[PDB]
Amino acid sequence: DVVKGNFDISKISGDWYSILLASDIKEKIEENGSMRVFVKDIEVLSNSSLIFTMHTKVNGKCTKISLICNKTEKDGEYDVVHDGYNLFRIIETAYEDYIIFHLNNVNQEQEFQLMELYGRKPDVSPKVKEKFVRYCQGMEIPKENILDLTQVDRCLQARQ
């Protein structure tokens, strides 16, 4: 049951796994990239806030970080502060299997967008994955800038 709007935030809480990562600036999502983070779980703080738990590599070690995200005026949109100011929203989700996030980072230097595909399990059908790829292309993210994380160290060995 795909959902493209009016999302039940409580039903996207819990564990997620970071499968595909995309950006119009590839350095942001390659190794050592400011945006190469691996989601661990999403939880509802309040009627209007979220807390993301994610892993990043710090001196070679998987390291847990927390990010507070607040709902904004536009529906489904959130904002967060990681290497600049970020606005993100759900593109679509199947609550039990996958979710697609679009993020926009606005900074002094150079504005850029992010696309992320999470799964309830460390992978999803290639049907879901290429719907994601077509999304990225429609948003003019080059296919060269889409990274499959299923075959990289995404800190799964550190989720607890």
Residue numbers in the entry: 6 to 165
Sentences from the paper on this structure:
Lipocalins are small proteins, usually composed of less than 200 amino acids. Yet for the lipocalins whose structures have been determined, they have a common tertiary structure consisting of an 8 stranded antiparallel beta barrel with a hydrophobic ligand binding pocket. There are 7 sequentially named dog component allergens, Can f 1 through Can f 7 and 4 of them are lipocalins: Can f 1, Can f 2, Can f 4, and Can f 6. Therefore, Can f 6 is a major allergen driving disease amongst those people who are allergic to dogs.
The recombinant Can f 6 crystallized in space group P3121 with one monomer in the asymmetric unit (ASU) and was refined to a resolution of 2.06 Å. The overall architecture of Can f 6 contains a highly conserved lipocalin fold of an 8 stranded anti-parallel β-barrel enclosing a central ligand binding cavity core, a four-turn C-terminal α-helix that packs against the β-barrel, and a short 9th β-strand (βI) at the C-terminus. There is a disulfide bond between residues Cys69 and Cys162 that connects the C-terminal part of the protein to the central β-barrel. Can f 6 crystalized as a monomer reflecting the method of purification, on size exclusion chromatography at pH 8 where the protein of correct size was identified and further purified. The PISA analysis of the Can f 6 crystal did not reveal any specific interactions that might result in the formation of a stable quaternary structure in solution. In the structure of Can f 6 there is unmodeled electron density inside the highly hydrophobic ligand binding cavity which is uniquely shaped. Unique to Can f 6 is His87 of L5 that closes the L1 loop over the ligand space via a hydrogen bond to the backbone carbonyl of Ser39 in L1. The calyx cap conformation in Can f 6, places Met40 of the L1 loop over the ligand cavity where it does not make significant internal interactions. IgE reactivity verifies the antigencity of recombinant Can f 6.
